[PDB]
């Protein structure tokens, strides 16, 4: 409604609104969750605890980042009104690490800390594509970017025998590695089966043992791995491949991870990915995996149904709640990822039919990459002299004589 | 050598510096981002206190025009083409409230993996 | 008039695609019929299509 | 302290019940283990803390940030800090830093920092 | 109420250091009483206690001591199945000191792998 | 790099030498080392010469 006059009902453009991106802003205590809540809830029919839309269902889409716990008591109502939400605890889901790219593989296992990173990102890559050119054979364009399917523990493996292993110079034969019993090793490949005990090194002429060339040098690295591939409360990556029910997911069940985060299980308009439980270090590698496989999704689908002279049939929008915490302004490598993801939402995402809602109590501290593209805003109280001044100077001019009322809304 | 470049973005400040500073001729439509602004009004030949105003309160259709083809700059509106572009863009809310679309899986995967592209 | 366009959207072939009474036609090439052979590139070029990769080269 | 609260926390999530032992941590002199500028002296220190402080809520944990230097302060664990409770700051930087980060630094209450008594 | 106090210049005890007759204790731990075992640290702090030092370190130093500690681990701890290096159990540091001087000075050479001789 | 390193080797070495009682030496402790040998064994690793025949060791 309007604050002027509480019986004229206030109406938006949807598709000059939804279609966009938008940006709510706000102070702690302004109750900017209740603003997306309600619009959320007007977008998908719900009313009174109600669902219009009960007899056929609509074509809505959603999908809430709840880094928090707060949304999922916002559209869950009685099962008498044939509404479901895909709630998605994921730390109590299925999300393998087989589906990341470069950047995410690399934050969750190698730290730019420490030095020789170079050798340290070349062996892994070199690792994770020959197992994933290993375990799937009939695929032919295989990258470091692939989503298909590869062992964690084989790369382990790999990079503990390299860092152990030991090449024999005896002439006459050739310069291969020799295991401790003095059978050679004729290929490399083997390494990825398990760990091997290799000869000692010795410098007289009947053995003359010579060390390799990445030999001690990921010390520190197999005891980050290892402390990575050990923790039960990472268990979401399906990281711990011995286990018979964490192997079982291969390439194969793709198509059935896709659908559980765009609520394709079997109907869903509201997705709620409740990102709570996930231990903050890797918060931001999920999102990025999250946001790339949809966006993916979506340009695949758009190039495909050009063909057919059509458009796409399933936009999506998507709510980024707390966003200052993984895209902010002044971040280093961790929230690399994260950013590198939703910039290309936020650029790139108008022609396949992705919208973004940047939710945050602080936009000084939200990338202005991602801000300077949303075009309408929702602009609760604010509190911060540095974040009225940043706000001020992203609104339409028109706008400017207005944008004083921010402090005084209530 | 009889070469000239009409070089068309809507993200003026994500183009290369080096092809941009050499065009003699600008027609400036409404540019909303403040970054896009502020390098438009560094580039323009002329910007004396009627230039650097007008950007972001132009209208639909209407266009500034400044360069050597004119002697005084000025906003212009300019007819729609006919026939028009095929400009498609997805209306969000349009599409919704159509019931439930169930796309092919199958296909996209498919074109995911490279296969069919 | 000489004018050639780089279009990346496909959205301007409405605009010079007129009735065929009025005797002008727009040579509107697409993937299907363009035809650029490989031998008219140069060192860059070729390395850049067949020998650049994401890994090292041996 | 975090992962004992943690486990707890998970098995009163089975009752239906949360942490009713709830800790508060108390850190004296925070720049001395925390500071921003910092390389492997203590690093094992800040991110023990920054999990809590990133993270505590959730379990039924809580943080308070004593120091009389901010500016040496890592930023990643005060930025988290909803209350402030602030006394006479000499030095610039530290009014500065202060200044940008409290959720009301209106001019009133931006001039009132070194005159408290 | 629970309240944990990080100190690093003393004081603070007597803030809550009152009379024994009004029931009130406080849990001052100090050098003298802290009992802080050194197999509950994970793999950096072990490093950083033992192996971390100002001169440079060796190809066999952080590789020896990570085994042994890990054998050690596994010896003094049957019951438990997945043993690492990060795994908070007991195990002996003089028997890791022992192994690694007994280590330090070996008098037999290879002798292929035969694993008699 | 290389300098520093073998400077710090050095006068670590020679303060472990001269003052064999104390344990915790290290290079910011403030006790007696000579110079000259410290110069002496830079001079000497500039001109160093390892023997390679084979079967004797390389000293």
Same mark, same amino acid.
């Given at each position: 409604?309007?604050?002027?006059?509480?019986?004229?009902?206030?109406?938006?453009?949807?598709?000059?609104?939804?279609?966009?991106?938008?940006?709510?802003?706000?102070?702690?205590?302004?109750?900017?969750?209740?603003?997306?809540?309600?619009?959320?809830?007007?977008?998908?029919?719900?009313?009174?605890?109600?669902?219009?839309?009960?007899?056929?269902?609509?074509?809505?889409?959603?999908?809430?980042?709840?880094?928090?716990?707060?949304?999922?008591?916002?559209?869950?109502?009685?099962?008498?009104?044939?509404?479901?939400?895909?709630?998605?605890?994921?730390?109590?889901?299925?999300?393998?690490?087989?589906?990341?790219?470069?950047?995410?593989?690399?934050?969750?296992?190698?730290?730019?800390?420490?030095?020789?990173?170079?050798?340290?990102?070349?062996?892994?890559?070199?690792?994770?594509?020959?197992?994933?050119?290993?375990?799937?054979?009939?695929?032919?364009?295989?990258?470091?970017?692939?989503?298909?399917?590869?062992?964690?523990?084989?790369?382990? %493996?790999?990079?503990?025998?390299? %860092?152990?292993?030991?090449?024999?110079?005896?002439?006459?034969?050739?310069?291969?590695?020799?295991?401790?019993? =003095?059978?050679?090793?004729?290929?490399?490949?083997? @390494?990825?089966?398990?760990?091997?005990?290799?000869?000692?090194?010795?410098?007289?002429?009947?053995?003359?043992?010579?060390?390799?060339?990445?030999?001690?040098?990921?010390?520190?690295?197999?005891?980050?791995?290892?402390?990575?591939?050990?923790?039960?409360?990472?268990?979401?990556?399906?990281?711990?491949?011995?286990?018979?029910?964490?192997?079982?997911?291969?390439?194969?069940?793709?198509?059935?991870?896709?659908?559980?985060?765009?609520?394709?299980? !079997?109907?869903?308009?509201?997705?709620?990915?409740?990102?709570?439980?996930?231990?903050?270090?890797?918060?931001?590698?999920?999102?990025? &995996?999250?946001?790339?496989?949809?966006?993916?999704?979506?340009?695949?689908?758009?190039?495909?149904?050009?063909?057919? !002279?059509?458009?796409?049939?399933?936009?999506?929008?998507?709510?980024?709640?707390?966003?200052?915490?993984?895209?902010?302004?002044?971040? =280093?490598?961790?929230?690399?990822?994260?950013?590198?993801?939703?910039?290309?939402?936020?650029?790139?995402?108008?022609?396949?039919?992705?919208?973004?809602?940047?939710?945050?109590?602080?936009?000084?501290?939200?990338?202005?990459?991602?801000?300077?593209?949303?075009?309408?805003?929702?602009?609760?109280?604010?509190?911060?002299?540095? !974040?009225?001044?940043?706000?001020?100077?992203?609104?339409?001019?028109?706008?400017?004589?207005?944008?004083?009322?921010?402090?005084?809304?209530? | 050598?009889?070469?000239?470049?009409?070089?068309?973005?809507?993200?003026?400040?994500?183009?290369?510096?080096?092809?941009?500073?050499?065009?003699?001729?600008?027609?400036?439509?409404? &540019?909303?981002?403040?970054?896009?602004?502020? @390098?438009?009004?560094?580039?323009?030949?002329?910007?004396?206190?009627?230039?650097?105003?007008?950007?972001?309160?132009?209208?639909?259709?209407?266009?500034?025009?400044?360069? !050597?083809?004119?002697?005084?700059?000025?906003?212009?509106?300019?007819?729609?083409?006919?026939?028009?572009?095929?400009?498609?863009?997805?209306?969000?809310?349009?599409?919704?409230?159509?019931?439930?679309?169930?796309?092919?899986?199958?296909?996209?995967?498919?074109?995911?993996?490279?296969?069919?592209?």
């Amino acid at each position: 409604n309007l604050a002027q006059n509480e019986e004229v009902s206030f109406t938006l453009d949807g598709d000059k609104f939804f279609s966009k991106h938008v940006a709510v802003v706000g102070s702690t205590g302004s109750g900017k969750s209740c603003a997306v809540a309600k619009i959320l809830q007007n977008v998908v029919g719900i009313n009174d605890a109600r669902n219009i839309n009960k007899s056929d269902k609509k074509n809505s889409h959603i999908i809430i980042f709840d880094i928090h716990s707060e949304y999922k008591s916002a559209f869950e109502i009685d099962k008498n009104e044939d509404f479901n939400l895909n709630y998605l605890d994921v730390e109590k889901l299925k999300l393998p690490y087989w589906l990341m790219n470069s950047e995410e593989l690399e934050t969750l296992f190698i730290e730019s800390n420490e030095q020789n990173s170079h050798n340290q990102v070349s062996q892994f890559k070199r690792a994770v594509v020959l197992n994933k050119e290993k375990y799937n054979p009939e695929f032919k364009k295989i990258t470091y970017d692939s989503p298909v399917y590869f062992n964690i523990n084989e790369v382990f %493996n790999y990079i503990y025998n390299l %860092n152990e292993e030991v090449i024999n110079k005896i002439e006459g034969e050739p310069s291969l590695p020799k295991l401790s019993n =003095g059978e050679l090793v004729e290929n490399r490949q083997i @390494y990825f089966n398990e760990k091997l005990e290799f000869t000692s090194s010795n410098t007289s002429k009947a053995t003359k043992a010579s060390n390799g060339p990445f030999n001690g040098e990921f010390n520190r690295f197999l005891s980050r791995f290892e402390t990575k591939l050990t923790d039960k409360r990472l268990e979401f990556l399906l990281l711990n491949q011995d286990v018979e029910e964490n192997s079982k997911y291969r390439t194969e069940h793709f198509e059935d991870i896709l659908k559980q985060f765009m609520g394709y299980l !079997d109907r869903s308009n509201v997705s709620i990915i409740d990102l709570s439980g996930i231990p903050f270090e890797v918060l931001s590698i999920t999102i990025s &995996l999250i946001s790339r496989l949809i966006f993916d999704f979506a340009f695949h689908y758009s190039k495909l149904q050009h063909q057919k !002279d059509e458009l796409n049939d399933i936009p999506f929008m998507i709510v980024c709640e707390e966003a200052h915490n993984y895209i902010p302004r002044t971040g =280093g490598i961790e929230f690399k990822a994260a950013k590198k993801s939703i910039e290309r939402i936020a650029k790139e995402g108008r022609k396949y039919g992705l919208s973004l809602m940047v939710v945050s109590q602080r936009p000084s501290e939200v990338s202005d990459t991602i801000l300077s593209q949303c075009n309408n805003f929702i602009n609760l109280r604010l509190t911060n002299i540095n !974040d009225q001044n940043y706000i001020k100077n992203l609104l339409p001019d028109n706008s400017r004589s207005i944008s004083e009322i921010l402090p005084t809304l209530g | 050598y009889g070469l000239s470049l009409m070089v068309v973005s809507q993200r003026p400040s994500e183009v290369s510096d080096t092809i941009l500073s050499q065009c003699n001729n600008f027609i400036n439509l409404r &540019l909303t981002n403040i970054n896009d602004q502020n @390098y438009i009004k560094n580039l323009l030949p002329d910007n004396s206190r009627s230039i650097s105003e007008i950007l972001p309160t132009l209208g639909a259709g209407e266009c500034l025009v400044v360069g !050597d083809s004119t002697p005084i700059p000025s906003i212009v509106k300019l007819e729609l083409p006919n026939p028009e572009p095929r400009s498609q863009s997805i209306k969000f809310h349009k599409k919704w409230s159509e019931s439930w679309r169930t796309p092919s899986f199958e296909e996209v995967i498919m074109r995911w993996r490279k296969e069919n592209g």
